[PDB]
């Protein structure tokens, strides 16, 4: 009974990072080493655990969070990072246990003339808490002066399109990201690595 990771990794379209998606995985066998050894992934980093240890553990639930960012932002998907993505879009806890997986999606997510579907949040009053998801669309008040519903000096719309084009440099090309996190409850532990099956 293999975990349906394909539904996440091979989805036709991914979420915008500000509106990142979460898939719950349960009641299945996960081969984390097979994922780790896939040449399809250019980023594969685990925190608080390794793929070998995950192959020998059972969890109640696994969460697969997925979204698109630009290449030069991939380094922000890690504990203790700063930047617009870590601060305002998708935040991992300092004590994160899990894995960050990423791959270049230029062939899927860029379009001649721009793919404007993918957004990120450029401004926020405070930093996100870990695993917080903010889909609000109020004017960002950058200074002490209220905006009163009008954009202008220090009054900005908080979301921004990437506009991915295939001729962008790699730092500006789209990357698909999957973050795996792990939950243990006082309940049957139905997601296991192959060694603990």
């Amino acid at each position, epitope marked *: 009974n293999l975990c349906p990771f394909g539904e996440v990794f091979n989805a036709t379209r991914f979420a915008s990072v500000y509106a990142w998606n979460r898939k719950r995985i349960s009641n299945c066998v996960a081969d984390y080493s097979v994922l780790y050894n896939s040449a399809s992934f250019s980023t594969f980093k685990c925190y608080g655990v390794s793929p070998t240890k995950l192959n020998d553990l059972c969890f109640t639930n696994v969460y697969a969070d997925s979204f698109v960012i630009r290449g030069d932002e991939v380094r922000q998907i890690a504990p203790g990072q700063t930047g617009k993505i870590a601060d305002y879009n998708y935040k991992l806890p300092d004590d994160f246990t899990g894995c960050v997986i990423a791959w270049n999606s230029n062939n899927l997510d860029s379009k001649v003339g721009g793919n404007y579907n993918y957004l990120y949040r450029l401004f926020r009053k405070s930093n996100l808490k870990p695993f917080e998801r903010d889909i609000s669309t109020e*004017i960002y008040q950058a200074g002490s002066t209220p905006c009163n*519903g009008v*954009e202008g000096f220090n009054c900005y719309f908080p*979301l*921004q399109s990437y506009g991915f084009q295939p001729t962008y440099g790699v730092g500006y090309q789209p990357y698909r990201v999957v973050v795996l996190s792990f939950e243990l409850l006082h309940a049957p532990a139905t997601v296991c690595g192959p060694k603990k099956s």
Partner: nanobody
């Protein structure tokens, strides 16, 4: 592409007021941000003012800020350009349109970002 039904405009004296309307059935204006543009003979089509799809943000070119206002009805199907303190320099063909492109800085919008253009309506301000 959607149909935007644009109306209003005409001849007004310097210092006067006009209202332009842009209507679209159902959820169009609550889905896509809108802009008002204008074009004088032999000049480029320039951004005037707009409203985010949210209905809670409006924004204005430096040429019209403090004189023009954008509003949207409760139904969210009709957007208005309230043109006050009109000057001869405001004489142009005015257009409404919508964009799928989200720019955090509205100051970066151009006509290339917009589509589903309304029919242009003449505004003429005479001294």
């Amino acid at each position: 592409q959607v149909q935007l039904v644009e109306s209003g405009g005409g001849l007004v004296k310097t210092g006067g007021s006009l209202r332009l309307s842009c209507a679209a059935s159902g959820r169009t204006f609550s889905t896509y941000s809108m802009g008002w543009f204008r074009q004088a003979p032999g000049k480029e089509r320039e951004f005037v003012a707009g409203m985010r799809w949210t209905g809670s943000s409006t924004f204005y070119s430096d040429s019209v800020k403090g004189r023009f206002t954008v509003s949207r009805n409760n139904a969210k199907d009709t957007v208005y350009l309230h043109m006050n303190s009109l000057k001869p320099e405001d004489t142009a063909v005015y257009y409404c349109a919508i964009t799928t492109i989200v720019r955090a800085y509205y100051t970066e919008y151009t006509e290339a970002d917009f589509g589903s253009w309304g029919q242009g309506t003449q505004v003429t301000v005479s001294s």
